[PDB]
Amino acid sequence: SMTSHSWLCDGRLLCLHDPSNKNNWKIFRECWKQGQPVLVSGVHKKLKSELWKPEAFSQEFGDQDVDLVNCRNCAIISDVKVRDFWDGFEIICKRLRSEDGQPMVLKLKDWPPGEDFRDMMPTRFEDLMENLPLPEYTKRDGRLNLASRLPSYFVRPDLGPKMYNAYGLITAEDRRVGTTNLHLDVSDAVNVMVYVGIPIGEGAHDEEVLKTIDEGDADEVTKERIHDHKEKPGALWHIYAAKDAEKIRELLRKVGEEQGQENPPDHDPIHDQSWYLDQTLRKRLYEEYGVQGWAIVQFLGDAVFIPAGAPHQVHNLYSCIKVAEDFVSPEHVKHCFRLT
Numbered sequence: 001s002m003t004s005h006s007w008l009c010d011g012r013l014l015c016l017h018d019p020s021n022k023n024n025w026k027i028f029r030e031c032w033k034q035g036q037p038v039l040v041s042g043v044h045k046k047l048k049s050e051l052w053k054p055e056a057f058s059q060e061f062g063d064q065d066v067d068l069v070n071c072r073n074c075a076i077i078s079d080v081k082v083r084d085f086w087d088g089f090e091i092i093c094k095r096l097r098s099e100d101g102q103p104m105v106l107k108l109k110d111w112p113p114g115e116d117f118r119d120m121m122p123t124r125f126e127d128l129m130e131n132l133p134l135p136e137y138t139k140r141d142g143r144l145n146l147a148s149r150l151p152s153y154f155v156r157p158d159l160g161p162k163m164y165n166a167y168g169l170i171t172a173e174d175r176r177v178g179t180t181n182l183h184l185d186v187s188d189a190v191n192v193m194v195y196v197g198i199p200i201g202e203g204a205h206d207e208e209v210l211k212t213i214d215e216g217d218a219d220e221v222t223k224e225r226i227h228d229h230k231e232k233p234g235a236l237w238h239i240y241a242a243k244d245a246e247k248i249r250e251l252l253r254k255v256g257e258e259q260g261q262e263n264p265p266d267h268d269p270i271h272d273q274s275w276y277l278d279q280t281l282r283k284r285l286y287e288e289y290g291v292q293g294w295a296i297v298q299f300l301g302d303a304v305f306i307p308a309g310a311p312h313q314v315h316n317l318y319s320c321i322k323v324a325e326d327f328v329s330p331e332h333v334k335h336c337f338r339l340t
């Protein structure tokens with residue numbers, strides 16, 4: 001039977017089932033006021049699927065110059081053609097190779113650049129903005145989005161959306177690395193998985209994706225959604241409550257010290273965006289600081305709602321295209337205020 005919603009993370013995460021249901025706000029707003037993230041699927045069924053394919057981005061924009069990041073060692077690959085990224089998205093034998101002769105796990109940096117998404121891609125902009133869930137919160141002019149309504153005493157978000165494009169992490173050693181490192185945003189955000197690429201050549205990558213999700217602390221219901229082979233898993237997230245940010249900073253200052261970093265006692269390891277919390281660091285955070293997070297597997301068409309101030313990190317399981325919009329809910333406006 002069709003249902004309005006279900007629970008993940010042992011009851012701690014709301015999962016809404018119908019992205020366009022006008023009653024979603026009634027269930028959403030209680031979880032959101034408590035500082036929890038929220039998951040919505042089925043957003044892929046609302047989109048024009050031909051607009052969000054890697055082959056179309058290559059054909060239409062392939063000649064633009066970009067930088068890439070090597071996710072395994074953070075090296076920057078400067079001033080290459082965006083087609084050099086898109087043509088290896090799902091075919092491993094087309095990927096740029098590191099000096100060891102291995103195909104690289106790459107992230108496309110700042111593309112489209114700054115606030116240019118709407119200008120470069122007006123049909124994609126329309127298709128996304130018209131199908132965002134919780135539209136009173138997430139649209140530029142939604143009645144519960146204060147972005148356009150606030151004075152300069154508040155940090156306002158950039159004009160979005162922003163697109164996040166990266167290959168999936170592959171090996172047992174890749175389990176300890178992030179696609180996006182631990183950081184926080186002063187605005188709220190919704191992140192939609194619009195495309196998941198499951199590769200070929202080295203296309204027998206069944207078991208290590210399962211081990212990554214299990215070691216990632218994914219709940220029993222999430223594990224049932226994986227065993228059921230009906231939906232493509234894109235990325236593993238860890239999200240922490242905004243109120244736990246300083247305890248995470250204390251852990252990371254202590255680990256930096258143990259590892260011989262030489263850092264002023266006030267320096268901000270979350271703002272540095274230099275850490276990924278692996279299985280060891282997540283266990284230590286729980287045991288030594290009493291901090292529990294949310295381990296979330298974002299499937300194709302899942303929209304992840306990230307509360308303002310909530311530290312978070314992303315680990316791609318397969319090749320992903322994600323599109324994110326920032327907004328300012330009245331529930332969390334304190335996080336962007338410039339005084340006390």
Ligand SMILES: O=C(O)CCc1ccc(-c2ccc(O)cc2)cc1
Nearest residue numbers: 206209210226228229230231232233
């Ligand atoms: O079980 C595995 O192979 C590893 C995890 C996983 C789980 C599900 C899929 C999948 C689902 C729907 C589909 O059309 C194609 C693929 C892929 C990967």
Ligand SMILES: [Cl-]
Nearest residue numbers: 035242309332
């Ligand atoms: Cl809060």
Ligand SMILES: [Cl-]
Nearest residue numbers: 121122123124
């Ligand atoms: Cl377009």
Ligand SMILES: [Cl-]
Nearest residue numbers: 025134135136
């Ligand atoms: Cl709404």
Ligand SMILES: [Cl-]
Nearest residue numbers: 179180181273
């Ligand atoms: Cl990063």
Ligand SMILES: [Mn+2]
Nearest residue numbers: 183184185312
């Ligand atoms: Mn973020």
